C-alpha cells in the first residue's frame, strides 16, 4: 500500500523519466521558494488576529494556485510513468508540444476537483467552531484530508483514460481501503515541507501505478 | 461542584436581588437581540471572505460584550456576597454606586483579555498545524473552562483587593474545584438561550466560591 508510493519514488528517479520528472519539479520549486520571497517582503507590507487571518488567506490562495498551475504537468507525467512500467520501457520519446493537448482537459479536471473540495472544506471548517463538537472536527479533517489525497492523484491516470466525473469517485469508493491507504501514506509524506517537492511527482507515479495494477 | 452554580441560580432568583439581577440581564438581552438585527441587515452589506467577516463579528461581538457588561457583574457580585452574608436578602444599594466601579472593572477586563488574547491566538495557530490539530480542541475545551473560572471568580476576588497574578495563583492553588465551577458554567454557556439567565447565576456562584473558601 505505501509500496505503490515507494515504487513511485523508484520510477520518478528512473533516468529516462528524469526529464519529465524534473520538468514540473523545477516550476514547483521556484514557486515554493517564490513563496517565502514574496511572503518575507510583501506580507509585512485585534491586529494579531487579523494578521494570522490574512496569513491564512495567503496560504489558501497560494496552495490553490499552485495546484491549478501544476495540474497539467502532473497529468503529462502520469501518462509517461504509465508508459515506462508498461509497453514503452524506460525513456519514452515524447516531445514538448504534446503538453498543449492536455491543457483544456487537465484544467477542467482540476477546477472540478476544487469544486468538490471547497464546499466539504467549508463544512468541516464550520464544524470546527461549534464549541463542543470540535472534538471530532480534526479527525474528520484528517479523513477527508487523505481521501482528498487519494482523488487528487488517482485522478491523473484515470482521466488520461476517459472516465466520468462521478464514476472515478465511485471506483474510488469501490475500493476504499487501498485508496485511503495510498492517499494516507502520500499524506503522511506530504507533511514534510522539504522532501515533498520530490514526493509530489512520486505521488502521481504511484497513482498511475495504482491503476495499472488494478 | 456544580452546586455552587445551582445555588447561584437560587440566589439569582431571590426577590431582593432581582433589581441587581435584572440590571445586567436587560442590557445583555437587548445586545443578544441587537446582534441578530444588525447581523441580519448589515452583514449582507459586507465565501472565504464571508466566513471571515462572520467569525470576526462573532468573536469581536463577544469581546465588546464583555468589556461592556464588565462593570454590572462586579456590582451584583458584591450583593450576592452581602446576601449570603450579613445583610440578608435585599441590600439597600443605590444607582450612583455604579459610578465608582466603572474605572476598576474596565481596568480589570482589559487585563483579562490581555491574558486571553495571546493564549487564544496561541491555540489558533496550533489548529492549522496538520497532524498536531488532533489535540487543539481538547486544549481549547480545557483552556475554555479555565477561562470561565478566572472570568467570574475574578469578580469577588477583585471586590476584595487582589493582584492579577495572585488571583491566578489562588486559582492554581485549587485547580480542581476551579476547573469544576468554570466547567459546568461552560457547559451551560453552550446553550444559546438559557445562558442569558445563567450568566448572572454564574457570577453569583463565583462570589459563593470566594466565600465558601
Author numbering:
A (entry chain B): 8 to 52, 72 to 240
B (entry chain A): 8 to 53, 74 to 240
Paper passage:
The protein has an extra-membranous hydrophilic ‘head’, comprising an iris-like arrangement of the two short helices, H1 and H6, and kinked helices H3b, H4a, and H5b. Besides not resembling other transporter structures, CysZ mediates sulfate flux into cells or proteoliposomes without coupling to ion gradients, partner proteins, or exogenous energy sources such as ATP.
The structure of PfCysZ was solved second, to 3.5 Å resolution, with crystals also belonging to space group C2. The PfCysZ dimer is also arranged in an antiparallel orientation but with a different dimer interface. In the PfCysZ structure, helices H4b-H5a together form a narrower angle with helices H2 and H3, and tuck-in closer to the rest of the molecule. The resulting dumbbell-shaped PfCysZ dimer is predicted, by OPM/PPM (Orientation of Proteins in Membranes), to lie in the membrane at a 31° tilt to the perpendicular, in agreement with the position of its central hydrophobic belt, as revealed by surface-electrostatics calculations. On the other hand, the PfCysZ dimer resembles the transverse pair of protomers lying at a tilt, just as was predicted by OPM, along the side of the PdCysZ hexamer when viewed from inside the plane of the membrane. Disulfide-trapping experiments of the transverse dimer, performed by crosslinking a pair of mutants (L161C-A164C) on helix H5 of PfCysZ, as well as the corresponding pair in IlCysZ (V157C-Q163C) confirm the dimer interface observed in the structures of PfCysZ and IlCysZ, and, as a consequence, the antiparallel assembly of the two proteins.
